[PDB]
Design an enzyme around this catalytic site. Structure first.
Site, PDB file in Angstrom:
ATOM      1  N   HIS A 173       0.806  -1.203   0.000  1.00 41.84           N
ATOM      2  CA  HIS A 173       0.000   0.000   0.000  1.00 41.84           C
ATOM      3  C   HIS A 173       0.839   1.253   0.000  1.00 41.84           C
ATOM      4  CE1 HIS A 173       0.484   1.095   4.295  1.00 41.84           C
ATOM      5  NE2 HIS A 173      -0.092  -0.019   4.719  1.00 41.84           N
TER       6      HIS A 173
ATOM      7  N   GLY B 176       3.372   6.087  10.537  1.00 47.94           N
ATOM      8  CA  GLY B 176       4.763   5.866  10.207  1.00 47.94           C
ATOM      9  C   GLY B 176       5.262   4.462  10.519  1.00 47.94           C
TER      10      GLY B 176
ATOM     11  N   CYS C  31       3.944   1.427   9.690  1.00 48.86           N
ATOM     12  CA  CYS C  31       3.738   0.347   8.735  1.00 48.86           C
ATOM     13  C   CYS C  31       5.058  -0.212   8.249  1.00 48.86           C
ATOM     14  CB  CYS C  31       2.869   0.822   7.558  1.00 48.86           C
ATOM     15  SG  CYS C  31       1.203   1.256   7.988  1.00 48.86           S
TER      16      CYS C  31
HETATM   17  C1  LIG Z   1      -6.318   7.176   3.402  1.00 52.34           C
HETATM   18  N1  LIG Z   1      -6.254   6.076   4.356  1.00 52.34           N
HETATM   19  N2  LIG Z   1      -5.865   4.855   4.020  1.00 52.34           N
HETATM   20  C2  LIG Z   1      -5.908   4.052   5.061  1.00 52.34           C
HETATM   21  C3  LIG Z   1      -5.510   2.581   5.011  1.00 52.34           C
HETATM   22  C4  LIG Z   1      -6.441   1.558   5.128  1.00 52.34           C
HETATM   23  C5  LIG Z   1      -6.019   0.238   5.046  1.00 52.34           C
HETATM   24  C6  LIG Z   1      -4.685  -0.020   4.831  1.00 52.34           C
HETATM   25 CL1  LIG Z   1      -4.092  -1.699   4.729  1.00 52.34          CL
HETATM   26  C7  LIG Z   1      -3.768   1.000   4.702  1.00 52.34           C
HETATM   27  C8  LIG Z   1      -4.174   2.307   4.792  1.00 52.34           C
HETATM   28  C9  LIG Z   1      -6.350   4.799   6.171  1.00 52.34           C
HETATM   29  C10 LIG Z   1      -6.559   6.102   5.648  1.00 52.34           C
HETATM   30  N3  LIG Z   1      -7.021   7.234   6.434  1.00 52.34           N
END
Ligand SMILES: Cn1nc(-c2ccc(Cl)cc2)cc1N
Ligand SMILES: [Cl-]
Ligand code: NA
Lengths: 306, 301
Positions: A41, A143, A145
């Protein structure tokens, strides 16, 4: 004497943590031999994350779009590909600090150490259990992840977890190192929720044995029970079933302390049915379920790692 | 989100652990630059438990009586000297893995990580606090002496504890890295007993601020308290006195959450009175006192 929630020494994993940047996003990677592993991601903008097509987002990237820093040194990305939900960045240099390691997928109930990291820099280490509902009760800020979870088996690091996201209740979800999620989760911004969790029965029992070994014995009683009777009690109190394999795994602890697994089960039955009556066990007023049988033996025998 | 008892990553200390042998005794040493630090009781024989004369035991030793093993490698001991209750063994190799480091003596209530080790090799890492009675509630087996406690601040390791012994209640005592014991303890096997231990009130308050930061407010109330009335109540629960220093130290967390420090004190007073009534706070059914104000800020940001 004494009994603490204890992580593995984290040195061998700290030497593998790097910083990975893609566009406006920085997170952590795991650098082993000549590949950096991180969540796929990392390639998403906030709108991409709403409904990503990862193969599509990826083909538009090339190597130079992935900025990888190991400490203060830049690594050169020479290839990129995905495996499930992890990105694999081929780099031009093997990690001279690569430990002996394996990728292993763990079972719910098993514990591991998380090395929390920010900008490629290790910040803290703590012990987690993979919950029955496949989340972990971690401690992660933005930060984090790409931070990883691991066990050490003699001198081999067994990597079992990469952090991907936080769920609305504040518990955490992630993948093994081959990018398969633990639990019914997906890496996209969509409505997702942890399922109702249960208590890890065999770990609670292991922890009762730990308590006895350390002199905390008030909950022992003259009674014993059967698997079937006890499993009825476990069901009612949202405890996982106890299997014969669990009883077998607890064998050594039962022989060492003189309390048979089903003798202990009778202590636990009584605790669930009546509470602690103002007392504590190893300093806790609730039943701890994040120590496995192996954890208790290890800490009460002093096994070491290099 | 989340809140965990978190330790510092241990790798900087791992590459400093060595095994020290003197006679039939083996324990751990901390190898920094060209010095190995270890408890001086490594020179005691079974006769010297109760009234060892360390100066007399040490003058009888030569450098080669000390075997120092770093991984597979013997280090050569070229000098030895005693400082308070630590022995400093000069060795012929500076540790190439020496981190940026310093030695800092901590005060009760301060937290630190412990790298438990046996035979010079790390077993596990966990988080401890210096109790008000100058003991620590550790996890140490025979062979763990010379294991160390530490914090890491911006790549600098501050060594604050070396493990020397276990008291009869199961709690642990040790020194700073200048070899001065924490508390009234000595490295003799003469009966000594820890002071009655008390709860680290400033840390509990910090942790209640952590609970608010992570979204939990059920334990707050509409009251406040004077500082002296708070201390009168809390000492009846074996809580340490809260000082104006502690009140000042909580200022930032108060500002972040909008709950004044004395208002938080009022919530704590009620909690001691009422218990948790089957609720939990950050996953615990007891009030937690092993997180400092500084820890909370670093973990919650
Ligand atoms: C824009 N955004 N994206 C996420 C997100 C959701 C699932 C995963 Cl696995 C990674 C990121 C949370 C927010 N606020
Ligand atoms: Cl201090
Ligand atoms: Na029983």
């Amino acid at each position: 004497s004494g009994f603490r929630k204890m992580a593995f020494p984290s040195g061998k994993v700290e030497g593998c943590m790097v910083q990975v940047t893609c566009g406006t996003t920085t997170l952590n990677g795991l650098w082993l031999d000549d590949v950096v592993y991180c969540p796929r991601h990392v390639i998403c903008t906030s709108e991409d994350m709403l409904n990503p097509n990862y193969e599509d987002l990826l083909i538009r990237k090339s190597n130079h779009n992935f900025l990888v820093q190991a400490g203060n040194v830049q690594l050169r990305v020479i290839g990129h590909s995905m495996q499930n939900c992890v990105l694999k960045l081929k780099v031009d240099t093997a990690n001279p600090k690569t430990p002996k390691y394996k990728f292993v997928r763990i079972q719910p109930g098993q514990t591991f150490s998380v090395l929390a990291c920010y900008n490629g820099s290790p910040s803290g280490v703590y012990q987690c259990a993979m919950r029955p509902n496949f989340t972990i009760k971690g401690s992660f800020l933005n930060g984090s992840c790409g931070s990883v979870g691991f066990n050490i088996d003699y001198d081999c690091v067994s990597f079992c977890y990469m952090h991907h996201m936080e769920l609305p209740t504040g518990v955490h979800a992630g993948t093994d190192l081959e990018g398969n999620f633990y639990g019914p989760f997906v890496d996209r911004q969509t409505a997702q929720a942890a399922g109702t969790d249960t208590t890890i029965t065999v770990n609670v029992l292991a922890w009762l044995y730990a308590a006895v070994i350390n002199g905390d014995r008030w909950f022992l009683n003259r009674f014993t029970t059967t698997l079937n009777d006890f499993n009825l009690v476990a069901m009612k109190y949202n405890y996982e079933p106890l299997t014969q394999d669990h009883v077998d795994i607890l064998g050594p602890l039962s022989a060492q302390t003189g309390i048979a697994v089903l003798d202990m089960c009778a202590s636990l039955k009584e605790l669930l049915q009546n509470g602690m009556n103002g007392r504590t066990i190893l300093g806790s007023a609730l039943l701890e379920d994040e120590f496995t049988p192996f954890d208790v033996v290890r800490q009460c025998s002093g096994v070491t790692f290099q």
